[PDB]
Amino acid sequence: GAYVLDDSDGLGREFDGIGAVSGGGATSRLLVNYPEPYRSEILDYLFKPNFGASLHILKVEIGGDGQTTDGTEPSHMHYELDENYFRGYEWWLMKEAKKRNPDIILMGLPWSFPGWLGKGFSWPYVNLQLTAYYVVRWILGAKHYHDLDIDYIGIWNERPFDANYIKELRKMLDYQGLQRVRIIASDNLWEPISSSLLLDQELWKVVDVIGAHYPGTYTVWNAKMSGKKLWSSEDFSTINSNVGAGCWSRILNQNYINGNMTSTIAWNLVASYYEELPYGRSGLMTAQEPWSGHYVVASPIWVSAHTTQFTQPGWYYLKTVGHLEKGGSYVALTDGLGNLTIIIETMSHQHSMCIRPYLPYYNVSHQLATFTLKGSLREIQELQVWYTKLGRLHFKQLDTLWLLDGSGSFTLELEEDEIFTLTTLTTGRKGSYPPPPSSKPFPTNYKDDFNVEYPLFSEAPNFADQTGVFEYYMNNEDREHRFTLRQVLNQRPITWAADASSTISVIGDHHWTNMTVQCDVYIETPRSGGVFIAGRVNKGGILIRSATGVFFWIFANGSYRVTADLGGWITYASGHADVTAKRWYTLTLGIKGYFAFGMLNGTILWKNVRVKYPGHGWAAIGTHTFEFAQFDNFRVEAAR
Ligand SMILES: *[C@@H]1O[C@H](CO)[C@@H](O[C@@H]2O[C@H](CO)[C@@H](O)[C@H](O)[C@H]2NC(C)=O)[C@H](O)[C@H]1NC(C)=O
Ligand SMILES: *[C@@H]1O[C@H](CO)[C@@H](O[C@@H]2O[C@H](CO)[C@@H](O)[C@H](O)[C@H]2NC(C)=O)[C@H](O)[C@H]1NC(C)=O
Ligand SMILES: *[C@@H]1O[C@H](CO)[C@@H](O[C@@H]2O[C@H](CO)[C@@H](O)[C@H](O)[C@H]2NC(C)=O)[C@H](O)[C@H]1NC(C)=O
Ligand SMILES: *[C@@H]1O[C@H](CO)[C@@H](O)[C@H](O)[C@H]1NC(C)=O
Ligand SMILES: OC[C@H]1NC[C@H](O)[C@@H](O)[C@H]1O
Ligand SMILES: [Ca+2]
């Protein structure tokens, strides 16, 4: 029937913005080595105002050297007394976002922590001041080295919080002159953080926002009672097809309507990680081919636009929002300056399923909606119209709708899976760049000598660490190996995921079946040290311990092994080898069909060793444990 949109009796909650997550883990990994102009174009679709997704909020992982879903991300403090604010790519990403949108909101949250913070235990709450010290340094560094103001700081992603830690974090922030930084907790469930705020006055005072993960558009009573801002601080996480776009469309509206949540943040920002890693293509768009330059501006980009391009942090929701009688919902916002945005969604059940949670079936059918602008909204002679149809027309602008009647009323015919945005704002724009190059597989012949003296990023391109951390390394005394790739962790992190017991970095095409991998390796630890190269590595990320394939190990005690698994439980071959520490060797591993061979300095070590087939996966390098080791002159030839 009719839906009243009124101002006169007051407003709803302040709108805080829409955002996305870069990190948890290494989700932006393959974006950094995109050639220009494509890399810059992708960033525009994400962050440029009145263009693409036009995001209000960017949330990033504070790397802790641990595996955090699709890879590891480097910490600013690998060891005690170590400080480096130029590792990884989150600094760069934040700067790129701020250049396009100076008003963008920045958040930081740790998934994992370096092992040395635990002081013997794998626990970040052993020394509260130390862990807070670590986190605050990251915030200080963002300002001092990159001119970044971090707006919000979290606790420990989907992990228990410590009330004394949060209080210490607040005290530490203030002590370092960061009074303006706000705290969000606890990036998990609504409980126990919500009840803890009601029971503890001192905890209530230091927490600014309650952020919950995948709330299914609902909150809980204690959260409402707190009087705190409530955010869906992580949501979405669905493959960016039309379905995922429908999911994203529905929850953007109904998170506030059903749960009073004034912000929603998607995991993840962009799918710049190998698709065969966990939750592949679960970003707002896709950019997983830096070698070709191909990127896909997926449907969720324009779903975001329907809200972001016509709302800003600081607008207020109207009291008058709700569901449509025949399915779907509507929200309305104002800036308090006479502008009005109305967002309408009619996502069907079959085309809006999220992975978390899965809604019981609900009906959606054709309907008419009549809207009447009461209060100070009674005015507004014209409204711009933007339309999207999923399943396929995206963010197309329709003809201005006029209210010269005086009734302050208008009517729409709605159908399944549609978005309408009705706004007084005239700045809307479907941004566009020419189509990027076509999809191409990872180069069947590939090499890297790691010879870069002033690298822009701390790690060689396309190498996605899945346990441990690999960096560019300059050794000035050695001439033949002055520039190498080095694994730099010397102890297991305070882990978020189940990191492997061995370090590993994967690269290439997961489809590869027959391949030849070569690399120069260097074992830094006497007697006990070990390294490997591998092919047909089929699992990574959160499942990195599950990785099977063909692994060629050599050890400083004068031995080698060939295993079917990263964990080394299953032996293909083993024996002795002329191998010691602090010496450069060239490993070659060849795999074809049922058989594999291995070479040491160009000489056959083992041949015709039967391996399981069929099987496919990436190539990789790594170390036996968390130990220093160097790699150089990497090459791979493969058949897909
Ligand atoms: C949170 O939002 C809910 C809406 O789901 C508010 O609860 C009531 O919602 C019904 C219809 O959904 C309205 O008729 C009531 O007027 C709402 N309550 C009140 C007190 O107005 C709830 O109030 C909101 N909580 C806040 C804003 O703290
Ligand atoms: C709706 O659009 C914008 C909201 O920011 C307003 O336009 C700005 O208004 C301020 C003062 O009100 C000026 O200083 C800016 O130069 C304006 N910018 C632009 C791009 O116009 C506008 O006033 C709002 N209200 C209406 C009725 O349009
Ligand atoms: C990888 O190597 C295997 C083994 O050499 C290939 O499988 C053979 O394919 C030929 C056809 O060209 C058959 O005649 C053989 O009988 C197959 N051998 C086995 C053991 O199946 C396979 O085609 C190669 N794959 C790629 C992508 O190069
Ligand atoms: C859904 O609603 C439509 C319209 O009222 C009705 O025709 C249809 O039978 C319903 N189907 C289900 C499964 O509820
Ligand atoms: O859905 C998975 C997704 N959500 C949970 C974690 O916070 C993320 O890193 C990621 O694993
Ligand atoms: Ca080199």
Is beta strand 418-423 parallel, antiparallel or unpaired with respect to 483-487? unpaired
Q: How far apart are CA 96 and CA 102, in angstroms?
A: 10
Two tokens, residue 213: 């993960």
> Which ligand 2 atom minimizes the distance to the CA of 335?
4
Q: Please check whether residues 272 and 337 belong to one and the same domain.
A: yes
Q: Tell me, in angstroms, the distance from the centre of ligand 4 to residue 366's CA.
A: 11
- How many domains would you assign to the chain? 3
Longest dimension (CA), the chain: 91
Q: Is the CB of 24 under 6 A from ligand 5?
A: yes
- Say if residue 419 is in the same domain as residue 547: no
Both 412 and 491 in one domain: the answer is: no
Distance of CA 152 to the CA centre of its chain: 17
Strand partners, 246: none
Q: Among the atoms of ligand 5, which is closest to the Cα of residue 158?
A: 7
Tell whether 265 and 218 lie within a shared domain.
Answer: no
Cβ-contact 594, 572 below 8 angstroms: no
Active site residues: 158, 234
To one decimal, the resolution in angstroms is 2.4
Residue 50 Cβ inside 6 Å of ligand 3? The answer reads no
For β-strands 382-389 and 340-345, DSSP reports them as unpaired
Ligand 1 geometric centre to CA of 321 (Å): 10
Query: Is 360 a pocket residue for ligand 4 (Cβ < 6 Å)?
Result: no
Tokens of 359: 């809604």
Backbone angles phi, psi at 188, to 5 degrees: -145, -125
Ligand 4 centre to CA of 68 (Å) is 43
HSE at residue 84, side-chain half, CA atoms within 13 A, is 16
Q: Which of 453, 450, 456 is nearest to 470 (CA)?
A: 450
Residues 104 and 32 in one domain: no
Task: Count Cβ atoms within 10 A of the Cβ of residue 387 and give its class: 0-12 exposed, 13-18 middle, 19 or more buried.
Answer: middle
Residues 358, 318, single domain; the answer is yes
Return binding residues. 69, 111, 157, 356
The domain of 599 spans: 441-640
214 lines ligand 5 (CB under 6 A): no
CA 593 to chain centre: 36
What's the CA gap between 247 and 118, in Å, rounded? 39
Domain termination residue (choose one: 440, 472, 490): 440
Answer yes or no: are the C-beta atoms of 530 and 554 closer than 8 Å: yes
Q: Looking at 206, 232, 258, which one is the last position of a domain?
A: 232
Q: For residue 590, what are the contacts with CB-CB under 8 A and spacing of at least 6?
A: 515, 516, 517, 596, 597, 598, 599
Q: Which of these, 115, 108, 206, 119, lies nearest to 166 by C-alpha position? A: 206
Residues 570, 621: one domain? yes
Last residue of a domain, one of 232, 255, 277: 232
Nearest of 551, 564, 577 to residue 613 by alpha carbon: 564
Determine whether the shortest distance from the Cβ of 201 to ligand 4 is under 6 A. Answer: no
SS3 of 613, please? coil
How many angstroms separate the CA atoms of 593 and 614, rounded? 7
DSSP assignment of 345-366, as one string? E---STT---SSS-PPP-----
Q: Could you list the residues known to form a binding site for substrate, using ranges.
A: 69, 111, 157, 356
| Residue numbers followed by a gap, the chain, C–N over 2.5 Å | 391
Spell out a b/e string for 241-260, using b for 16 or more CB atoms within 10 Å of the CB, else e. bbbbbbbbbbbbbbbbbbbb
Residues 161 and 12 in one domain: no
Q: 141 near 123, Cβ under 8 Å?
A: no
CATH number at residue 16: 3.20.20.80
Strand 418-423 and strand 340-345: the pairing is antiparallel
CA distance 189 to 185: 10
- Long-range (24+ apart) CB contacts under 8 A made by 554-559 are 554/521, 554/523, 554/530, 554/579, 554/585, 554/587, 554/600, 555/523, 555/529, 555/530, 555/579, 555/624, 556/523, 556/525, 556/526, 556/527, 556/528, 556/529, 556/530, 556/580, 556/581, 557/527, 557/528
361 with 346, same domain: the answer is yes
* Residue 486 DSSP class: E
Domain shared by 163 and 51, yes or no? no
Bridging pattern class, strands 209-213 and 229-236: parallel
Would you give the distance in Å from CA 597 to the centre of its chain?
38
What kind and span of H or E run contains 303? Answer: helix 300-308
Return phi, psi of residue 625, to 5°: -130, -165
- Domain of 589: which CATH number? 2.60.120.560
| Residue 334 CB less than 6 A away from ligand 3 | no
Instruction: Specify the ligand 3 atom closest to the Cα of 640.
Output: 27
User: Of all atoms in ligand 2, which is nearest to the CA of residue 338?
Assistant: 27
Domain shared by 360 and 509, yes or no? no
Residue type, 381: Q
Whether 495 and 122 have beta carbons less than 8 Å apart is answered as yes
CATH number for position 218:
3.20.20.70
Pull the structure tokens for residue 188. Answer: 């998990």
3-state secondary structure of 521: strand
Distance CA 255, CA 262 (A): 8
Claim to verify: residue 226 and residue 320 sit in the same structural domain: no
Mutate to test the pocket of ligand 2, among 337, 376, 381, 425 (most ligand atoms within 8 A of CB): 337
Ligand 3 centroid distance, CA of 593 (Å): 6
Torsion of CA 31, 35, 36, 37, to 10 degrees: -70
